[PDB]
Design a protein around this ligand. Structure first.
Ligand SMILES: [Sm+3]
Ligand SMILES: [Sm+3]
Length: 509
């Protein structure tokens, strides 16, 4: 009569049933296909839900759904605002690497700042477990002929190259079976480069991709063709680099950006990879546009934090993704809206690290440009309507010494320039347990395939700004309609024990 007794869960259930106290399979299929806008909505689905969520056994045997089970469903995997069908790998995985968005880390060794902070294998472990696929090892000479990793010329803690590798070996495929790219930033002496080469082949072993693939000769292989393998990125012999090492760079030869060009008469190759500071990438996306998109169809593009970000702060990755850029390196060790939109995007596709870019970005001859949209398959404007109905059991350990929270839900649309919007509810004074808002927002999203819906919850405070409580980012095409519950993740991406936001989602054309 407290934890339960969700006024709005009653308000939505009676709506369903009508005048009955339970949901007939017939009535349910109506709720599912009409409210829940379910394409599967038919007797069979409606029955799976009853058998998979109905608490009352009798009401389950007599093929019905009670308010208890109606709730048990809404709070469940199936009730979630994030398409449960997407919690599994479900996209084409036979496209070239340049047709995927690779989950990328920057200065992975770092656990904190870029100047005096610690470096730890824990950093590579934690990143790999967040499904990160492209790691970064800044290699340098170490005492007694053993290379070390650390952010050169700073007081950042140093760690052993070998240790870092053992760590990568163990956790590389815990969260995904898909290929991990080890970006090497070499500074070691030739004798220590030889050491690096010996540890790579010795520690990594068969997991390492030492030789090219037969048949792959005109374009990068696929995540499938490289499953459970690791490839190395770095400089490759143009003649200060040991053959032992260079022979290991096969599909990710580090090159300097020499300009775009299109398939018409020679340019960068599918095995070569340019890199860009967030600033430069933003410059080229403005000056070149689809010149860059086309460019990323064939080759991989690695983006990386500006240098002025010693605080290990991050950049919004969306604008980079919109330009086809695949290896957008962010400081995973830093909580913030940026890493939020980052992992959120990557929870998609079973959270396997690789995410197939929209078809218009895999078109070598595409004329798409995120900063100056034209007409094309990309322009397919919808209209999202989100009813921030009722949040429940919102965190409150942020202020250990007990009192009460002042909640407010911010809903923001992340996407192409035009679609980049945001809204928010009124603060519900002192109530994090059963806050009610019943407020609907409305967004117009011209280019949905590049959009992500972010539900964020704050703690209004005139003391120290509106404190962060929890949030959840859902990629547009992964958003479910009707009545759903949004499960709030913590500041570290760790889904809170039982913190959610009940909402009603709608998408019209
Ligand atoms: Sm570096
Ligand atoms: Sm308060």
């Amino acid at each position: 009569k407290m934890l339960t007794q969700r006024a709005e869960i009653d308000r939505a259930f009676e709506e369903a049933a009508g005048s009955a106290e339970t949901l007939s399979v017939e009535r349910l299929v109506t709720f599912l296909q009409h409210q829940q806008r379910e394409e599967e909505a038919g007797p069979a689905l409606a029955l799976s839900l009853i058998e998979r969520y109905e608490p009352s056994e009798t009401a389950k045997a007599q093929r019905q759904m009670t308010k208890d089970g109606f709730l048990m469903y809404l709070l469940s995997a199936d009730g979630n605002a994030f398409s449960l069908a997407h919690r599994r790998v479900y996209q084409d995985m036979d496209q070239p690497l340049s047709h995927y968005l690779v989950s990328s880390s920057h200065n992975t060794y770092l656990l904190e700042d870029q100047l005096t902070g610690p470096s730890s294998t824990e950093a590579y472990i934690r990143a790999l477990c967040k499904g990160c696929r492209c790691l970064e090892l800044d290699c340098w000479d170490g005492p007694n002929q053993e290379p070390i990793i650390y952010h050169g010329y700073t007081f950042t803690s140093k760690i052993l190259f070998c240790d870092v590798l053992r760590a990568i070996r163990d956790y590389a495929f815990k969260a995904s079976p898909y290929p991990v790219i080890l970006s090497l930033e070499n500074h070691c002496s030739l004798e220590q480069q030889r050491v690096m080469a010996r540890h790579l082949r010795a520690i990594l072993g068969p997991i390492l991709l030492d030789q090219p693939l037969d048949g792959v000769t005109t374009s990068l292989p696929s995540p499938e063709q490289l499953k459970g393998k690791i490839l190395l990125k770095g400089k490759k012999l143009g003649g200060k680099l040991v053959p032992e090492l260079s022979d290991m760079i096969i599909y990710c030869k580090s090159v300097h950006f020499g300009g775009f060009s299109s398939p018409g008469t020679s340019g960068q190759a599918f095995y070569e990879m340019a890199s860009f500071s967030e600033s430069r990438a933003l410059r080229l996306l403005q000056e070149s546009g689809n010149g860059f998109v086309r460019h990323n169809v064939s080759c991989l593009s690695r983006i990386y934090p500006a240098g002025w970000r010693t605080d290990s702060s991050n950049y919004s990755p969306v604008e980079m993704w919109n330009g086809g850029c695949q290896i957008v390196a962010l400081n995973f060790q830093t909580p913030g809206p940026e890493m939020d939109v980052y992992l959120g995007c990557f929870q998609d596709n079973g959270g396997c690290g690789y995410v197939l870019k929209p078809a218009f970005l895999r078109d070598p001859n595409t004329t798409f440009n995120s900063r100056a949209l034209t007409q094309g398959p990309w322009w397919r404007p919808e209209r999202l309507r989100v009813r921030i109905i009722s949040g429940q059991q919102l965190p409150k350990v942020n202020k250990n010494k007990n009192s009460i929270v002042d909640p407010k839900v911010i809903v923001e649309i992340h996407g192409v320039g035009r679609d980049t919007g945001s809204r928010q509810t009124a603060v519900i004074t002192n109530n994090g347990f059963n806050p009610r808002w019943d407020m609907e927002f409305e967004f117009e999203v011209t280019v949905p395939d590049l959009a992500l819906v972010r539900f964020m919850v704050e703690d209004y405070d005139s003391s120290s700004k509106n404190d962060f409580i929890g949030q959840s980012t859902i990629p547009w095409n992964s958003l479910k309609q009707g009545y759903r519950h949004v499960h709030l993740l913590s500041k570290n991406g760790d889904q809170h024990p039982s913190a959610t936001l009940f909402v009603k989602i709608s998408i019209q054309d």
